[PDB]
Design a protein around this ligand. Structure first.
Ligand SMILES: O=C(O)[C@H]1O[C@H](O)[C@H](O)[C@@H](O)[C@H]1O
Ligand SMILES: [Ca+2]
Ligand SMILES: [Ca+2]
Ligand SMILES: [Ca+2]
Ligand SMILES: [Ca+2]
Length: 198
């Protein structure tokens, strides 16, 4: 496990990092601390640490407290080996349509949702651990567009509300090698038949 060459460095930022289409931001293990962008509370007007435009990728960062409004993803994004040490309002939001994959990494201390889906998308969480969270995935409340969520090799500990919540009857959640400890209720969807294994 060659840890990255920026490991032990801390980057203090005062504005959102914008990653453009076709660009990959590779932090090489850098820890990011945002200043002036939010306190990581549940206040809904914090800034994102990263804005990933459509077709942008992000890898190998640690997001330190304050988690602010985390990572905004505008579709067709891969987010690989990102560690949220203390999730802010949420960890990652899907803001526009496309495929978004979170592969590797982990999240801890989400007072409410880790992943927030606000546009129709295909959303995959793979090889991921999260501890002390309200929900792993939430589709924006009272919306009825379609998301399809895949949880593959995911381990969850201490889930206060549920693994995933959606108010959309057309949305679907598919899981494969999902391990959950200390969780209220697994899935808050209009019908449990929207949830499938594979
Ligand atoms: O964090 C977010 O994306 C969301 O959080 C809340 O659910 C809010 O009601 C939404 O409109 C959106 O702001
Ligand atoms: Ca929110
Ligand atoms: Ca937190
Ligand atoms: Ca948010
Ligand atoms: Ca919230």
């Amino acid at each position: 496990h060659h840890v990255g060459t920026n490991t032990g460095g801390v980057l203090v930022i005062t504005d959102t990092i914008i990653v453009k289409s076709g660009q990959t931001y590779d932090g090489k293990g850098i820890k990011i601390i945002a200043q002036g962008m939010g306190d990581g509370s549940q206040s809904e007007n914090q800034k994102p640490i990263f804005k990933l435009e459509k077709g942008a990728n992000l890898k190998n960062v640690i997001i330190g407290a304050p988690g602010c409004d985390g990572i905004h993803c505008y579709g067709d994004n891969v987010v690989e080996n990102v560690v949220w040490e203390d999730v802010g309002e949420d960890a990652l939001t899907v803001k526009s349509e496309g495929v978004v994959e979170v592969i590797g990494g982990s999240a801890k201390e989400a007072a409410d949702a880790v992943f927030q889906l606000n546009a129709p998308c295909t959303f995959k969480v793979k090889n991921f651990t999260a501890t002390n969270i309200g929900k792993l995935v939430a589709q924006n409340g009272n919306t009825t567009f379609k998301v399809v969520i895949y949880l593959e090799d995911v381990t969850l500990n201490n889930v206060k509300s549920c693994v995933a919540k959606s108010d959309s009857p057309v949305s679907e959640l598919w899981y494969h090698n999902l391990n959950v400890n200390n969780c209220k209720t697994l899935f808050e969807f209009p019908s449990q038949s929207q949830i499938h294994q594979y």
